[PDB]
Chains A and B, each alone.
Chain A
Amino acid sequence: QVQLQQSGAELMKPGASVKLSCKAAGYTFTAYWIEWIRQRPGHGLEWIGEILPGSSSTNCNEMFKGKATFTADTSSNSAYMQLSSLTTEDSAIYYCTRDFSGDRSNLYFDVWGTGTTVTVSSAKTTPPSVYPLAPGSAAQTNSMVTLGCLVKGYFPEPVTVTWNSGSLSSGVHTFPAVLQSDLYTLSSSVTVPSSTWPSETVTCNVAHPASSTKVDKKIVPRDC
């Protein structure tokens, strides 16, 4: 049971400092470098730096000079990385892993933490506006009909979207959120047989726990 346990997700204002932690169990804590890795959304892995506890010995990628400070606490088996002067471009997942101080090939970067997400933003908590997406009265094809809802202007992630409380999930696409201003927007679509609709209701269920928002939006036929 070698484990590396990372601290939880963080939201921080631009310019603040965050301190992340990586808590080790199942091995001699002093015998391994703790390694810190960054992954920006949709980008590759980058190496940030390392510390050998408890020693003065740390190292880092030059890109992170003035940005990342490593410390370690042998009593609680914990290593820390502090990121100072946060900007938007610090928003990423941060992973820790370990690297044996010695001469054994299989103990280099062998176990990985599951990551800590940092989000940097000035935004305040904001509930989503939820809008129905009904067809503008087209051919409605011949076989299937596609409906959606648009979930707009919320902060922070995440929202949950369901269709008919989770019963209808087969024809569904919920798209990743994107930043509109400093706020998030996503949409979800469902494709159902045209027999099904407007015959009867289709409803999207939107939840935003961070604002304590729960909403139902029935997709109502335009008829103009």
Chain B
Amino acid sequence: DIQMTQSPSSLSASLGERVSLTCRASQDIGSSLNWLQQEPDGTIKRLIYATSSLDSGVPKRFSGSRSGSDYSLTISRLESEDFVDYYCLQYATSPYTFGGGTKLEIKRADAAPTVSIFPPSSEQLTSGGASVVCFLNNFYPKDINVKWKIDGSERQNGVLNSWTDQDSKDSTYSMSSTLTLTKDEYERHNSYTCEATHKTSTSPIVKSFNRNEC
């Protein structure tokens, strides 16, 4: 089947800048390439058809072109609503195929995470379980590492992470990390630490508590 190699897979840019995305077809597709945009709520909308034509009611900042096996979507000047996902679609020969997508994110000033750690609740302890929760809030850029420490040692099992999308008001990312243990395994130990590594500081941000401290 025809392969569409879409690049870049991710890109950061600021308001007002120009960006272009590229789909490399593995075999000739002619002018038979669409560009699509997908909103965070899931709405897909066609932007460009037949390589270069603009859909009705699509703003003029979008345009499409080809050069050899390379097809491009160009956004002359970024507006804030443009920072979503984009896919190309070849409809030359079935099976139809999409490039792998590009997520566009807004550039902003680097920010360090605000880190908070939480002990299990007493209601939870009376169930049989103990979740330790760490929030790493409002950081930029999005690349972040969390590590859990127990009595000084690194812990990897039982750790579930969740990430928010880029926030539309301040353009930062937030992350929760949850370490889940049985009541007994939790009470076999003393200090609990979550450690965040991020570009904004050379050394990790570290939050701990001690459960024998009350």
In the complex the two chains form, is A180's CB within 8 Å of B180's CB? yes
Chain B interfacial residues counted at CB < 8 A: 53
In the complex the two chains form, is B95's CB within 8 Å of A178's CB? no
Query: A61 at the A/B interface (Cβ < 8 Å)?
Result: yes
- Chain B residues near A186: list those with CB within 8 A: 162
Partner of B87, one of A44, A62, A111, A180: A44
- Chain A residues near B99: list those with CB within 8 A: 44
Query: A105 at the A/B interface (Cβ < 8 Å)?
Result: yes
In the complex the two chains form, is A47's CB within 8 Å of B97's CB? yes
Cα distance A128–B70 in the bound complex, in angstroms: 50
In the complex the two chains form, is B114's CB within 8 Å of A146's CB? yes
**Chain A positions 109-137 with a Cβ under 8 Å from a chain B Cβ:** 109-112, 114-115, 129, 131-137
**Chain A positions 134-163 with a Cβ under 8 Å from a chain B Cβ:** 134-138, 144, 146, 148, 150, 152
- The main secondary structure of chain B at its interface with chain A is strand
- Chain A residues near B50: list those with CB within 8 A: 105-106
- Chain B residues near A111: list those with CB within 8 A: 46
In the complex the two chains form, is A108's CB within 8 Å of B91's CB? yes
Cα distance A223–B214 in the bound complex, in angstroms: 8
Cα distance A140–B102 in the bound complex, in angstroms: 40
Binding site for A on B (CB under 8 A): 31-32, 34, 36, 38, 42-46, 49-50, 53, 55, 87, 89, 91, 94-101, 114, 116-121, 123-124, 127, 131, 133, 135, 137, 160-164, 174-176, 178, 180, 207, 209, 213-214
Binding site for B on A (CB under 8 A): 35, 39, 44-47, 50, 59-62, 93, 95, 97, 99, 105-106, 108-112, 114-115, 129, 131-138, 144, 146, 148, 150, 152, 173, 175-178, 180, 185-187, 189, 191, 222-224
